[PDB]
Amino acid sequence: MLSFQYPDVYRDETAIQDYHGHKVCDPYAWLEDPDSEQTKAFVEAQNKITVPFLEQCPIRGLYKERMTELYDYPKYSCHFKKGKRYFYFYNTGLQNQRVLYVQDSLEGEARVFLDPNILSDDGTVALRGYAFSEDGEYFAYGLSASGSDWVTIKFMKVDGAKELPDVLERVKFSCMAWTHDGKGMFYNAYPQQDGKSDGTETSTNLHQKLYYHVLGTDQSEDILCAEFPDEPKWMGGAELSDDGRYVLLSIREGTDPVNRLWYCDLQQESNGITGILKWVKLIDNFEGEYDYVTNEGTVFTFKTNRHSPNYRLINIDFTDPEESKWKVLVPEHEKDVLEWVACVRSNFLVLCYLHDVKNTLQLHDLATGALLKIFPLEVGSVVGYSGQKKDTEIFYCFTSFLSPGIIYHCDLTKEELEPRVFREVTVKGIDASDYQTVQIFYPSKDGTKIPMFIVHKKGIKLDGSHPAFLYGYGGFNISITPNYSVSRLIFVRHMGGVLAVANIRGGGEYGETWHKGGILANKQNCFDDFQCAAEYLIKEGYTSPKRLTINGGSNGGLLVATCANQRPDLFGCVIAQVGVMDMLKFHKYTIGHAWTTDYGCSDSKQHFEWLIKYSPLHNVKLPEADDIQYPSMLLLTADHDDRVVPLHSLKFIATLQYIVGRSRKQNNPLLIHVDTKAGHGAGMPTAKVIEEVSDMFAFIARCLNIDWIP
Template identity: 55%
Template sequence: MHRNFRVSFSFQRLLDFLPRTSHPRFVCLREMSKIADQNPLALSKKVIEPIVYPTIRKDEAVEDTFHGTQLKDVYRWLEDPDSTETQVFVTSQNNISRPFLENCNEWKKINSKLTKLWNYAKYGCPMQHGKYYYYFMNTGLQNQSVMYQQTSLSGESKEFLDPNQLSDDGTIALAQKSFSDDGSFMAYGLSESGSDWIKILIRNTETGKDLDEILNKVKFSEISWTKDNKGFFYCRYPEQSGKTDGSETSQNEHQKLYYHRLGESQDKDTLVVEFPEEPNWRIQSVVSDCGKYLILAIVKDCRDNIVYFADLEPGKAISSKLNTKKVVEKFEADYDYITNEGSKVYFRTNKSAPNYQVIIIDFEKPEENNWETLIAEHKTDVLDWVRCVDEDKLLLCYIRDVKTVLQANCLRTGKLLREFDLEIGTIVGTSGEKKYSEIFYNFSSFLSPGVIYQFDFKTPEQPPKVFREIKLNLEGFSRENYIVEQIFYKSKDGTKVPMFIIRTKRDTIKPRPCLLYGYGGFNISMLPCFGLSGLMFIDTFDGVLAYPNLRGGGEYGEKWHNGGRLLNKQNVFDDFQAAAEYLIDNNYTSKDRLVIQGGSNGGLLVGTCINQRPDLFGAAVAQVGVMDMLRFHKFTIGHAWCSDYGNPSEKEHFENLYKFSPLHNVHTPSSNEEEYPSTLILTADHDDRVSPLHSFKFTAALQDAVRNSKYQKNPLLLRVYTKAGHGAGKPTSKKIEEATDILTFMSKSLNVDTINLKDEQ
């Protein structure tokens, strides 16, 4: 999910705080399949039995006043995950949804086929640290990828870290890692059951053994080593009452930065930076490439940061708070550290550049009037990330009309040195550091799981070579049998929105089952990427996939982002609904064959759209969605999302949020046109990013609203997974289970027969 490269405290790091599932940028096609056979799809005669929903208590006494408006919150009691009543609610919902999904032939067949298709070797980019190379590999169905170590790229590999050995069910995952400068130690974070909480351990890379110390209470933290290899900076939260296993809902406040020395227990760590007057600030730290500076990016939400730095004196022990100096004082732009040459520090920023540029700030004279522009903002392309390699090269990745562009520029002059030839797709992983001339990048597309390329700046005359191609274990699959097209459609206000459509080449365009997936938020770009479940949707249902790049994302820079956040959030919903109308009007699908899907912020998208346009969709899948827009900021890291959603404590934002909040806009159907589409709501008990309470309350409101409506025949289901979180670190077995549930639900809800789906053992 996360890229293998370090972007210090860049916007990519902010993704750790966003409401999302697996990285939306890479979610596009969720896994893969064979070509469909030639038989035309026939309408099914399936009949879904009416569902009797459990009676859910309403507490009419709970009432809030927002800027003079009184609102009842009758399902407030579902915010307590540990109460017996909430547990009974979860059990009663699973007792409906699980039999609905699993007690049918489709579930078993889809699960069998998905398991077979998932079983191919997956690789990450090689990474050099000290005298060893490392890479991740999954043989196919391992719950977690294994980290391997080798002395050379052609040398023998040995297991270095296997998370599968840490739990029987694969629910302990490697969440992050950071090597000491000389490569002799690796600090790594482990998460359990999908929680954002991690514990940090330290492994000797020579012996493969862990040191004795374990660091706890860590969340949303960098691991930044000092250049003497004696320790590292990390962030942790204070002790709090109650549990911290990912199933709690309490807010995360008062993060502090500590320095840990190797060989010492956590209670001896030194507190180096804190901001007691700012409980919601989070500290992102990086030790500069030269080792002289500790650079801090302070964030309070999911956009913009201020910048501090502290001098690190070589040879001097870090035993007290550091003296920090402020470089950027206002929260008005993003600043991502790239590298530095002495006191001249390079940043990627959108300060006065909505598409981002590279600037130089001299820490000896940091006033803004002394800043220099090294690489100016491109007129149309968005600078997605930058890293320094081979001492004096900058590797830059741009987004051009929702496709990746990779190039190298000179660190000293900013001059373009070379462009890398890429097809339509996305770089989903890179590795390379300033001290090494060699880089690797993993390129993926809708129809390719990945090709890892190797390039050495010492031999610039040699083109990048294929280091490893990730090959599917799919008999009969051919990319030539599919069409990937990018179209631009008009949204409600006339804005042109791009959308990718993937389908088989053999057919003429006619109404088919269609999966429309969306996100639209937090400056995140949804780029062309590979996935199994998406192409299995085409294969099994003779379907079409559609991925619109909604406003609120980062596909066209900060202007595109601003067009879909705060008071402009309705534009995101309009864009999504306009995409559905385009697909219907252009004969790709019909309303009864159109299913929408989204996760996290995309779950909010789905929840809002089925309220606003229930007549437009045949089915909907909302994964770990933000559904209560008046209380989202009160739980875990939800307060960080106010930069995109707005703060309900402010009247203007309350009035806007109240208009589209899924929980507060549920209706009772009074006609066939107002009937909700078949809806599957998914959440997990250890999701401490978007607490499951959102899905609980929304489900309760939906089921109560339709209970006595003669017009509501479509099922409204909640599925709650156990020992799972928001998506990161999810074991393969649970990924396959969830994908099977979703595809089975789509099969039953779209009222179509499956094709190319045999009884596989």
């Protein structure tokens, strides 16, 4: 099958570094420089063999055509109200970027408010964050080009959609919060730096500061409200309390769900916002998370995980702040995770729980925390919501594996609450009743039961003859819940596949204990969990090693890459998207330093000892048995992925091709595709999403020689 030759790639055998007495050779360290002619030549040479391989079989064109047809359905986001107007995002079907619409009432004719599509020919300029003024008459929005995390904030006057001259630069991982007087907005920015700041650089991001921009002035005039010079990794995001009296500063260091919480009573400022605010350090440590829900005077309601891994709601009175005085408004549940909470119609709280990886939604009284109403939902996820304190209605968006979703509306001014379907779209060509979703719990190596969703055509025989697509992430307290994916359904319907999603440790499915179960010294638990999911699908007859494909992105890319090294005999195909592969150097680039709370850091001897055992880049090794080779592998990255710098994938593929690719027994391809004008994934235009999925499934089809089922 392989009719190409791997590119010549220079090995710097002098690249030797000592890690606490452990010598580590990094022959491809030169790939860390994205700007060199050597690195640009490497990328060119790799894409030169990968592209023809993906485009050879006509199955890619069949898949692309079906994806283009089926993905072409109306996509609406949850309606939300700001001031006297309603807004919602909508994509007719195949627009590169969804468009923001506005209407003066729910029965009023909607009009285009902000269309990102006209900002570029290829839809590579996308919205990244936005914030309306308290009165809804002004609007700030961030724009990212080519997938970069970097943002340029722009402003508009809502009435007439008038462009304002205000432009903020050097914005990244930023909050956006307007003061209620309508004078200006808080945001974050990074100091100027040598070299580029467009997403192709690898420069570490430190010393993020909190600024305040007065509308109608130049950015050079902005006020510095908070900075942490002695703590370069600290990031402080601002938000205004519901009553506009307080600025709440949430300081984070790392990716754990914890934050310091400082506040500033704006009325106590000597003469408005003129510099460093009079911060009161309410919670001045990183021992727990405090997520503002609402306040009534000095009594602040926060969602926290402080001695509550499944989360709960507490009320902290600023006038009697000692922890022993906090009141538990909604106690922690023994197993279900309280995902998020919103306050609406003054005294209602909307609580969203995760019960065995499925969402539930309910309304509670703010004064007592008592349950008042349960909003009925099918098995799936709540992916959208609107309803702030002053609002008298809520909208909530639902989705699942088999149907696009439903947007629900509920008028909260009614004595008897009657939620109703506001919008519902079904994809013609994908009959949901032909498939089923089942949830099973399988034991991992240590006996822990791990949840796994399996989606397949009804009536299939569990004889191991079906190709399977197993997905996982496992980390950063992220819960992998049901979502609608046309691309995966095409695999099921047109490639006769079985979809599986394993809720492995590291995730947030069972709270902070689930998270802690897949980090630091116990990161191996993630890999073991995932390998056991594969073993389950195989044993129970859903698939077989030669027919199994595993996929994951970012931390999930690390997941699948490590699994390929540890159990090459268990997988037929592996697709690793934008993955962290060099676990010894990840902290040196862009925002990589933030991930040490999940992974550890090689600077530490103890941590190095954990990292070196699973780091994809440092564990590529020819399988011992003659009849075992590495699975077919496809790494996908982009040149503007400044979240997980592409060097991770570049170094990894060079290593796989040299150590494994050159071996005579290796006949499965080990390829990389580096895209242009794209990044980690957020904001990717529809055109690119379609090309990516077509590539992924064409690769699977060719490597496993699967026939297309019309």
